[PDB]
Amino acid sequence: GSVKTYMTGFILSIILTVIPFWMVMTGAASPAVILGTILAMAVVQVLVHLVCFLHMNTKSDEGWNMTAFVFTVLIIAILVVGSIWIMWNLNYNMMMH
Amino acid sequence: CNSALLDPKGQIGLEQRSLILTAFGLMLIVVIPAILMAVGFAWKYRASNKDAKYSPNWSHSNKVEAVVWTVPILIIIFLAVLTWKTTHALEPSKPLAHDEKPITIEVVSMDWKWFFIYPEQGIATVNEIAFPANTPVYFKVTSNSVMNSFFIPRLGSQIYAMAGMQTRLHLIANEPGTYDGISASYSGPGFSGMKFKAIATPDRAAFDQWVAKAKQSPNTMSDMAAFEKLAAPSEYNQVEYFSNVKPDLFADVINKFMA
Amino acid sequence: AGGTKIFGFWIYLMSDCILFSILFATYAVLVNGTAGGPTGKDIFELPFVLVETFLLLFSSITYGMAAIAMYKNNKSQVISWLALTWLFGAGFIGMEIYEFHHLIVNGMGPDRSGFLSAFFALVGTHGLHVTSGLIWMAVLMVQIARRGLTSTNRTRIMCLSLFWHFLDVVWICVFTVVYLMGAM
Amino acid sequence: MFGKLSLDAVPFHEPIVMVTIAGIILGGLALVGLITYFGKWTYLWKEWLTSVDHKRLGIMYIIVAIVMLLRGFADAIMMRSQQALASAGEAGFLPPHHYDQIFTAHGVIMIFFVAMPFVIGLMNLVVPLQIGARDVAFPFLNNLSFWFTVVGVILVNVSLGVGEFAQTGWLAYPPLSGIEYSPGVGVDYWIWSLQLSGIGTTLTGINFFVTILKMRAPGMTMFKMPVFTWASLCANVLIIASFPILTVTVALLTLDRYLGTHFFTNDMGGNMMMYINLIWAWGHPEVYILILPVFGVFSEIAATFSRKRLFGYTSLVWATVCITVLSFIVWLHHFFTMGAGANVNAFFGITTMIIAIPTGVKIFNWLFTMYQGRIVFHSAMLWTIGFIVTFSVGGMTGVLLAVPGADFVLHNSLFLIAHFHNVIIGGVVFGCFAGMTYWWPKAFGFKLNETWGKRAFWFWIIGFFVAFMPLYALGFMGMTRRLSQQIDPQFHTMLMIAASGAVLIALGILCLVIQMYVSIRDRDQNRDLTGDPWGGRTLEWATSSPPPFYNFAVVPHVHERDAFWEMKEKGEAYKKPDHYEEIHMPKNSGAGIVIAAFSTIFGFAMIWHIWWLAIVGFAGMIITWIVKSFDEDVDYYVPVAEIEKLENQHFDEITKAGL
Numbered sequence A: 001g002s003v004k005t006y007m008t009g010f011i012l013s014i015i016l017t018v019i020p021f022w023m024v025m026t027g028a029a030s031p032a033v034i035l036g037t038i039l040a041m042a043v044v045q046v047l048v049h050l051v052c053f054l055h056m057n058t059k060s061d062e063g064w065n066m067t068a069f070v071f072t073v074l075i076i077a078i079l080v081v082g083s084i085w086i087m088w089n090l091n092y093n094m095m096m097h
Numbered sequence B: 001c002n003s004a005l006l007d008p009k010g011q012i013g014l015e016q017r018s019l020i021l022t023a024f025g026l027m028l029i030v031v032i033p034a035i036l037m038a039v040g041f042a043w044k045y046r047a048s049n050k051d052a053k054y055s056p057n058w059s060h061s062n063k064v065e066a067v068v069w070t071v072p073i074l075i076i077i078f079l080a081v082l083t084w085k086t087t088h089a090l091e092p093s094k095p096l097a098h099d100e101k102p103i104t105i106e107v108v109s110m111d112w113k114w115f116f117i118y119p120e121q122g123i124a125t126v127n128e129i130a131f132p133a134n135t136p137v138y139f140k141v142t143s144n145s146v147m148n149s150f151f152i153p154r155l156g157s158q159i160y161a162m163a164g165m166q167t168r169l170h171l172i173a174n175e176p177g178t179y180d181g182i183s184a185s186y187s188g189p190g191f192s193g194m195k196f197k198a199i200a201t202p203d204r205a206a207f208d209q210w211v212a213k214a215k216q217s218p219n220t221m222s223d224m225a226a227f228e229k230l231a232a233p234s235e236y237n238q239v240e241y242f243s244n245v246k247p248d249l250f251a252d253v254i255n256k257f258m259a
Numbered sequence C: 001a002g003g004t005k006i007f008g009f010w011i012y013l014m015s016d017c018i019l020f021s022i023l024f025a026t027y028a029v030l031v032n033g034t035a036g037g038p039t040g041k042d043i044f045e046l047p048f049v050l051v052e053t054f055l056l057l058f059s060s061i062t063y064g065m066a067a068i069a070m071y072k073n074n075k076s077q078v079i080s081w082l083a084l085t086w087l088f089g090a091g092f093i094g095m096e097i098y099e100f101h102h103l104i105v106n107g108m109g110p111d112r113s114g115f116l117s118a119f120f121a122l123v124g125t126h127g128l129h130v131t132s133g134l135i136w137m138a139v140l141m142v143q144i145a146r147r148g149l150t151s152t153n154r155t156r157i158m159c160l161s162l163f164w165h166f167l168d169v170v171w172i173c174v175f176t177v178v179y180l181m182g183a184m
Numbered sequence D: 001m002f003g004k005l006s007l008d009a010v011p012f013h014e015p016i017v018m019v020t021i022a023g024i025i026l027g028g029l030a031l032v033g034l035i036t037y038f039g040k041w042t043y044l045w046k047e048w049l050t051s052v053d054h055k056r057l058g059i060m061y062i063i064v065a066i067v068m069l070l071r072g073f074a075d076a077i078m079m080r081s082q083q084a085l086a087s088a089g090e091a092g093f094l095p096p097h098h099y100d101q102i103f104t105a106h107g108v109i110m111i112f113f114v115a116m117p118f119v120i121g122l123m124n125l126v127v128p129l130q131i132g133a134r135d136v137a138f139p140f141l142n143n144l145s146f147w148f149t150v151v152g153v154i155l156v157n158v159s160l161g162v163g164e165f166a167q168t169g170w171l172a173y174p175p176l177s178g179i180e181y182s183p184g185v186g187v188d189y190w191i192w193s194l195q196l197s198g199i200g201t202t203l204t205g206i207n208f209f210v211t212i213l214k215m216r217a218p219g220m221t222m223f224k225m226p227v228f229t230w231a232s233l234c235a236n237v238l239i240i241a242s243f244p245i246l247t248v249t250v251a252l253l254t255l256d257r258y259l260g261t262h263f264f265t266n267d268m269g270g271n272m273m274m275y276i277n278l279i280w281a282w283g284h285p286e287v288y289i290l291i292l293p294v295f296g297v298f299s300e301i302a303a304t305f306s307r308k309r310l311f312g313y314t315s316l317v318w319a320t321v322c323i324t325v326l327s328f329i330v331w332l333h334h335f336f337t338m339g340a341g342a343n344v345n346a347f348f349g350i351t352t353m354i355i356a357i358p359t360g361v362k363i364f365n366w367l368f369t370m371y372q373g374r375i376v377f378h379s380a381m382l383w384t385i386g387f388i389v390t391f392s393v394g395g396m397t398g399v400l401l402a403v404p405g406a407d408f409v410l411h412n413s414l415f416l417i418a419h420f421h422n423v424i425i426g427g428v429v430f431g432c433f434a435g436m437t438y439w440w441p442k443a444f445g446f447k448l449n450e451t452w453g454k455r456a457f458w459f460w461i462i463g464f465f466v467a468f469m470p471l472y473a474l475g476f477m478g479m480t481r482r483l484s485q486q487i488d489p490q491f492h493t494m495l496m497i498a499a500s501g502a503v504l505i506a507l508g509i510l511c512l513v514i515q516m517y518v519s520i521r522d523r524d525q526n527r528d529l530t531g532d533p534w535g536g537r538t539l540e541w542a543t544s545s546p547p548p549f550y551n552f553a554v555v556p557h558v559h560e561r562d563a564f565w566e567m568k569e570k571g572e573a574y575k576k577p578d579h580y581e582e583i584h585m586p587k588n589s590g591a592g593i594v595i596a597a598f599s600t601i602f603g604f605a606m607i608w609h610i611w612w613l614a615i616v617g618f619a620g621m622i623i624t625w626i627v628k629s630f631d632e633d634v635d636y637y638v639p640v641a642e643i644e645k646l647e648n649q650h651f652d653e654i655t656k657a658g659l
């Protein structure tokens, strides 16, 4: 039933946490393959928790409750990437050149 | 018209006067008709004006709404091409092309005064700089304290002064004279007296006689013990000259925050 | 009525997710701001974070079974499933307190080395939300024990379901950016 | 009693503070003495203070904003007086310790406790009426949000008498606001005023987002909504997505001063440029929170007093949605001179001028709303015409500042100061007085005085221009902001004109007080009887004046834009239902006042380091939250005997006055 969506989303998030942890704790001979798969499994497991636990739906508040989440992801991406890009140029400048 | 930004004496100030003038004249093609329509439609279409055409159900025209979107778009399109070109030409820390071997002056903002170091002359001053006219001046600006802003309004741009950080500024003076510089970012109780003079000399012989004057002082800046004695909080400082300085004093001010 | 509050709480979590992203942006700027002190590799014990990650994951599926029991009429099993997810969240808080007590006693507090300020302000603000949801869970448990699975109690279960699963979503971003990227 | 409170914290031997201390203590005791004289304590409680009614709460927001407008103007008249005396070589009154608290308090009060409650209180009164709703989505949360704003105005006002306020400017930049350059309680007053009032407005933005989306009338789709509702919808989106940025940024400053952390410090890996990045990421969406419902106010007034439908509804709606997204990508224009690259400065310079495109579409759509109307020159229509002239001058000035090369000589000048007083006085204050004049008969049942409302306009118009067009000239001459002592004599004769223009603004505030007195003195002669004093187009004018406390006996069915206008042209909307049903209304609650009373105890104890009191204050807010959750009598039903009594007294006013 609805146990099956909770149980699959729990099994999946077990796998999506063990593999990023096992790569850092072992080493896996590549810092760039590690960094890619860690951010990939973080995004995938966030998507698993929205679908299976938070029950994100396109038809839940006549379109809303989903567009509110998509809007704030864009705000977070504007705020985080924008502040990192600004502070990287402010810190590359203000250096003893 | 003779007011320190509309009458500038440096190349950066003169290029920024044309930038202010062309931007202001571009926006006037849409702001003057907006103000004229605000008064003209109010007068022509009064309730007491029985001659004007009354159309209460007219709320949509494609040609009117096309022009309402197009003409603000076209002005900002011209203004963005101007913004992109002039930000890459009027940028501080872009050296000016003159082949005159610029004078580097190191600027430390204190509480509440301006400390200037002349590292290739071995001279330090408080609240006064001199430089030759028609030579570029490379400013390396830092703070010993809270954030200030180094501004000579008649010569060009401003830049923030931050502790542990080194901003850069390039200026030039096309005419000799003395120009009042200020702190343009509020920094405490003595902020109103953070005013310095910036003397552009007629030639380099008058700059050489000011450097030789400023090394006849008995005061030195030969250690950071003398720096922190002078970095004590003080207000409305006189012009003071130091004859000997530490050979890399400006890096030591930055390194007391970054280490 | 009930669905208006549940939608309105979802809008609050979107503002609460913007609140956490400022803490993540502050951490990314200040992570290399170690003042001659410890970096992430000198501090982060990754077996300890794996146990903390699985405790918050176990409390997410335990709240999911509490909501399943609310969609039948078994008031006793909502209480029993809420009793376990309180234990897994109290285990999560008790490990973060043990992690912060080890740093503060050993001279690695927030007042040293402003990387440590951004570490304590992101992991600490997450644990303040878990503590806030642990208080809300115990207030909800004594309301259901006293009044039953009423319509107001059923809306409060689904409001805390949004809150509790959101804290596990934030923690996926926490252990990746802070711990796993810091211990590479 | 404990902490740093010492009785030397009270500014004795300082007469310009102690006179205004006694002017509020004796002013407050005289106000307290009138309520006990007339026996109105049990009426202020149970009808106003505990009220979950959005009409009662909207009025009380504006009362707070008008009272704080007097304090925020009385110290701006002291800065104009000091700058006119500092030039021509006099060290007069206001030493720099005294003066630097004044521009900091003027900025905080006028943004957070004047402009914000006036905009929020206009959305509180009007937006549930325009969508056909009976109340706001979360009515207890609306009452709690008001009292968190009251905690903000209490903490700023007690800093006048108990300690001192911040001396850092209104945004409290780092290290000057750090614990080693500001060791006193002034930044702590700034921190906990903004924190406690800032969580109140966050709950306001959540409340009106869900109200507009979920509580609308049947048949009213999103593109049949009133334009003021569209403007309130987009303004509340910016509250939800930017006031969390203020909550983190002030809390990170709180950890720096209290726990000694290193976020924005100079030394131990701290970055003080991160705060200025963070405080303007909230800072520019805040100024679009203020100007968006003002755009919605002027759209309803221009349609009503031109007797013409609003031109270009879809273009005006999508210009509002354009601004609420573009407001989050422009914030680096406030620190162009910090030292970022040419690519970063030109990117945020270009996209700052992109946000001027939807503002120009809004301006020209109001111009063609009145292109072929019959314009009635009401007081509220005068503020609309005066807004278009004033905001176009001040908006044009900010686009000049949006060029980074032009901003390098105009940053932190009086040109900047004159820019944002051109778009706040010109935009927000003009829109708040226009909506006050427009919706006064709906809030109270009688019309304001038309003669004194026009005189208040003519002093607020070019009286502003005498006040702030000299500061445009002073920004070119090189005069910077926050200048207190020994100002240059060449800046005199232009600071003298700016001081004279503030006297004309003072006469416009005085004309507002006379307009309020004469209207209350003559309210029985200027009564609004049908509920529609003008020819109104939206659903607010379908009710009685004031509305029947449930707003609607039967919720209306909407078929078109300007729902009340289409009803009148079909002969409807004065239709008596054959039967009524009971209305489910929320109850008044004493909590929210109690939660805020513990919060101002918690805030005052955190400022003065009274840690036992801050624990008691914080635990009081949580126990009151917990004990409110156990309450079950949160609602009641209005009987049909009360509904039929209140509607038959409206439907004979319709009959005895023509309709």
Ligand code: HEO
Pocket: B027, B030, B031, B034, B072, B075, B076, D287, D288, D290, D291, D333, D334, D335, D352, D353, D355, D356, D357, D359, D360, D361, D363, D391, D392, D393, D394, D395, D396, D398, D399, D401, D402, D403, D407, D410, D411, D412, D416, D419, D420, D423, D424, D427, D428
């Ligand atoms: C609610 C008030 C408000 C409003 C509406 C605005 C609107 C704008 N702000 Fe002013 N800002 C406001 C409040 C402030 N801004 C500030 C600071 C500020 C700075 C910083 C300068 C500096 O720090 O040195 C810039 C560049 C701007 C740009 C603008 C622009 C381009 C608009 C535009 O949105 C205006 C758009 C309107 C226009 C353009 C006129 C209408 C259009 C017409 C008539 C026709 C169309 C014309 C064209 C398309 C050209 N803002 C500060 C400084 C705080 C501090 O420093 O302490 C405050 C308070």
Ligand SMILES: CCCCCCCCCCCCCCCCCC(=O)OC[C@H](COP(=O)(O)OCCN)OC(=O)CCCCCCCCCCCCCCCCC
Pocket: C005, C009, C125, C128, C129, C131, C132, C133, C135, C136, C139, C140, C152, C155, C156, C159, D247, D248, D251, D622, D625, D626, D628, D629
């Ligand atoms: C710096 C620390 C500050 C900490 C302040 C807050 C935390 C203290 C503890 C709070 C938790 C106790 C909550 C009270 C329990 C009862 C609540 C309840 O049952 O209500 C459920 C409610 C649904 O609404 P309804 O059903 O109408 O109930 C009305 C309540 N009067 O659902 C609701 O919508 C109400 C419950 C919502 C709870 C929200 C959680 C608060 C999270 C706070 C984050 C703390 C850290 C912030 C960081 C600062 C910035 C960096």
Ligand SMILES: CCCCCCCCCCCCCCCCCC(=O)OC[C@H](COP(=O)(O)OCCN)OC(=O)CCCCCCCCCCCCCCCCC
Pocket: D031, D040, D044, D048, D060, D063, D064, D067, D150, D153, D154, D443, D444, D546
């Ligand atoms: C404790 C220490 C700290 C103190 C800090 C201050 C706390 C903040 C207090 C702010 C709360 C706002 C108070 C709002 C009261 C509003 C009362 C009001 O307007 O009543 C008028 C009433 C209307 O009569 P009615 O015929 O019903 O009109 C219908 C309108 N829908 O007309 C009547 O017939 C009733 C007549 C009696 C009303 C008298 C009350 C005067 C207003 C109260 C004070 C407002 C001014 C000061 C506010 C300070 C705000 C900072």
Ligand SMILES: CCCCCCCCCCCCCCCCCC(=O)OC[C@H](COP(=O)(O)OCCN)OC(=O)CCCCCCCCCCCCCCCCC
Pocket: C005, C006, C008, C009, C012, C159, D137, D138, D139, D140, D141, D142, D144, D195, D198, D199, D202, D203, D206, D244, D247, D251, D595, D621, D625, D628, D629, D634
């Ligand atoms: C917010 C930004 C900053 C975040 C950190 C601090 C704040 C944390 C608390 C935020 C809680 C937000 C909850 C919003 C939910 C909105 C939707 C909802 O479910 O509302 C339900 C209810 C409203 O119900 P209503 O219909 O009005 O009537 C209820 C009758 N019992 O709503 C409620 O009754 C529940 C909410 C009301 C109670 C909240 C008041 C307590 C807040 C105290 C904060 C303490 C902070 C101190 C530390 C300083 C901060 C650094």
Ligand SMILES: CCCCCCCCCCCCCCCCCC(=O)OC[C@H](COP(=O)(O)OCCN)OC(=O)CCCCCCCCCCCCCCCCC
Pocket: D058, D059, D060, D062, D063, D066, D067, D125, D435, D436, D437, D439, D440, D443, D444, D513, D516, D520
């Ligand atoms: C959309 C627009 C929103 C507007 C928001 C509100 C802002 C302004 C607030 C004032 C407006 C409220 C007053 C009108 C309400 C109705 C008054 C009323 O019914 O009159 C009662 C009372 C005298 O009447 P009574 O003799 O008791 O019996 C007759 C009843 N019909 O009449 C009275 O004398 C009542 C007095 C009430 C006023 C006290 C409120 C204080 C707020 C004032 C703000 C500051 C004003 C500047 C300083 C004024 C003092 C000099």
Ligand code: HEM
Pocket: D073, D076, D077, D079, D080, D103, D104, D106, D107, D108, D110, D111, D114, D115, D168, D169, D170, D171, D414, D417, D421, D424, D425, D429, D467, D480, D481, D482, D483, D502, D505
């Ligand atoms: C109505 C007449 C007003 C006058 C005469 C006035 C006057 C002033 C003056 C003289 C300054 C300082 C300029 C300087 O630093 O040199 C100032 C700053 C400021 N004003 Fe106003 N003001 C008025 C209204 C408002 C309003 C309605 C707002 C609403 C938001 C406001 C917000 C601010 C802010 C934010 C500052 C900057 C604070 C700071 O410098 O730290 N002002 N005002």
Ligand SMILES: [Cu+2]
Pocket: D283, D284, D287, D330, D331, D333, D334
């Ligand atoms: Cu801005």
